[PDB]
Ligand SMILES: CC(C)(C)c1ccc(N(C(=O)c2c[nH]cn2)[C@@H](C(=O)NC2CCCCC2)c2cccnc2)cc1
């Protein structure tokens with residue numbers, strides 16, 4: 342079992358370079374619109390309290406240099422939507438894939454194509470944490486890299502990257518420009534709140550371990566939903582809901598292990614640790630595979 | 640720190656479906672040749688001891704069905720090189736990238752594009768282990784999926800997937816049909832040999848840790864190459880060579896921790912969100928991404 346990303350080709354044919362002033366970062370070129378973080382128009386003295394409406398009104402089309410490979414794209418118009426800037430260009434992208442824009446919830450996973458200067462650098466799998474941050478691998482200039490899923494050759498864009506937080510994690514927006522969580526595109530004192538382990542995902546991963554070869558962690562016990570939550574919250578696990586129990590139903594039915602029986606196994610794993618053993622290759626309980634990801638990989 | 644694969648677009652464009660009789664798997668379409676495991680001409684009845692030159696002599700061009708997307712490719716010739724089948728087609732691939740066929744060394748990493756029915760399904764990062772297996776994620780029908788590295792628009796293909804071993808690990812060939820490891824494309828009882836941990840990659844990953852926040856494992860001490868290799872033998876770690884040390888040079892500079900200083904640390908032994916010593920990042924992997 343691997344954390345597997347989606348093949349990135351459909352997104353690669355969309356990545357461009359956007360330069361405004363002395364600042365360069367990445368854009369996403371779909372049809373005749375280039376999307377990028379609006380903070381590309383921030384100046385070095387703007388960074389603490391920029392007024393983006395005032396910064397924008399002072400720009401004309403030619404202040405924005407867009408490059409797709411070696412080809413320069415002529416920007417013919419521009420507007421702002423929440424925290425993303427939309428640059429209208431004279432050419433529709435011939436490589437535009439079937440796509441849609443989605444806003445995802447905590448626990449959801451997606452692939453990230455890390456890019457620099459509009460050129461793709463690497464692809465990895467990621468997840469939206471309950472504190473609305475991303476535990477990414479981003480260097481300076483990665484802004485405008487996007488996160489996505491691919492389902493039936495339609496690309497679901499769910500994340501555009503904006504900034505790094507003090508603890509090394511990352512904040513960004515959906516493709517309508519609205520931030521995940523309470524962060525702002527502003528040099529400021531903001532920090533990610535406390536984060537929880539994603540209980541529904543850990544349970545999905547235990548079922549995946551059963552689907553493959555391992556039953557060593559099961560036990561003969563069961564538990565009520567409330568007792569499970571009272572224990573698991575003592576380890577900073579996210580409370581399990583009735584929705585999460587319904588969601589695990591198909592894996593439960595597939596393996597023959599009731600959801601609350603699997604909850605009993607998890608309670609014990611938290612109590613004992615793994616005692617030198619491994620589950621699917623890991624000595625930690627993994628929480629970035631969803632019930633959907635499990636069914637896909639098997 | 641994340642396990643990250645190369646962008647896969649240049650390779651996605653080369654994947655086709657190959658059917659011979661009742662069997663289907665994936666092929667690599669470069670210029671006007673499709674590459675795939677020769678065991679696609681095996682049938683269910685003769686899995687135990689195929690005679691491949693015989694099965695191929697009895698074959699004709701029309702025995703092979705090649706589909707690139709929804710376009711059927713007309714096969715105009717067939718040929719075998721070691722354990723890979725080469726199907727000549729009448730159309731060069733307009734999406735062929737700059738490429739080379741390369742053969743990698745144990746401890747080197749590559750990206751894998753897992754496919755089913757010629758269709759790219761996912762991408763992930765792998766390492767060639769010292770027992771010449773791959774700890775991959777491959778379902779039935781993944782045969783024909785390739786591994787690769789990219790070096791400024793040139794795709795170096797290093798792996799084609801053939802089969803799974805009973806421990807759940809995987810065996811394949813380079814693109815010239817030469818197996819990695821003592822494995823045969825036969826329904827036989829073969830197993831992976833004992834697997835050592837890749838010591839130079841573990842050290843590289845510790846340097847990646849120091850480069851980020853994690854510094855707690857460092858110490859004031861140093862070991863000798865020989866005293867460490869004595870501990871390495873105990874714990875089934877690959878012995879460390881002067882070549883491994885020289886290759887970690889750049890990272891030893893960037894941190895001020897000499898290899899034998901880090902080796903003292905590694906002797907004593909969460910470090911990057913892991914409670915295992917990770918050994919599938921090369922020195923080069925660490926320098927990239929960082
Ligand atoms: C203008 C604004 C909103 C303050 C800003 C400034 C710099 C960036 N960062 C760019 O690298 C960058 C910016 N523009 C082109 N590149 C980096 C970044 O977040 N440093 C933060 C440092 C503390 C205060 C807030 C910004 C970055 C590094 C690694 C991965 N992701 C992003 C992002 C946003």
Ligand SMILES: CC(C)(C)c1ccc(N(C(=O)c2c[nH]cn2)[C@@H](C(=O)NC2CCCCC2)c2cccnc2)cc1
Pocket residue numbers: 662663664678679681686777778779780781782801802803804824825826827
């Ligand atoms: C003809 C030959 C060499 C015996 C063979 C037969 C089946 C396959 N396997 C195909 O899935 C497959 C084959 N052709 C189309 N699909 C599976 C496989 O490796 N081993 C079985 C056969 C060898 C002995 C025991 C297990 C497989 C591959 C990748 C991931 N999980 C399972 C590979 C090679």
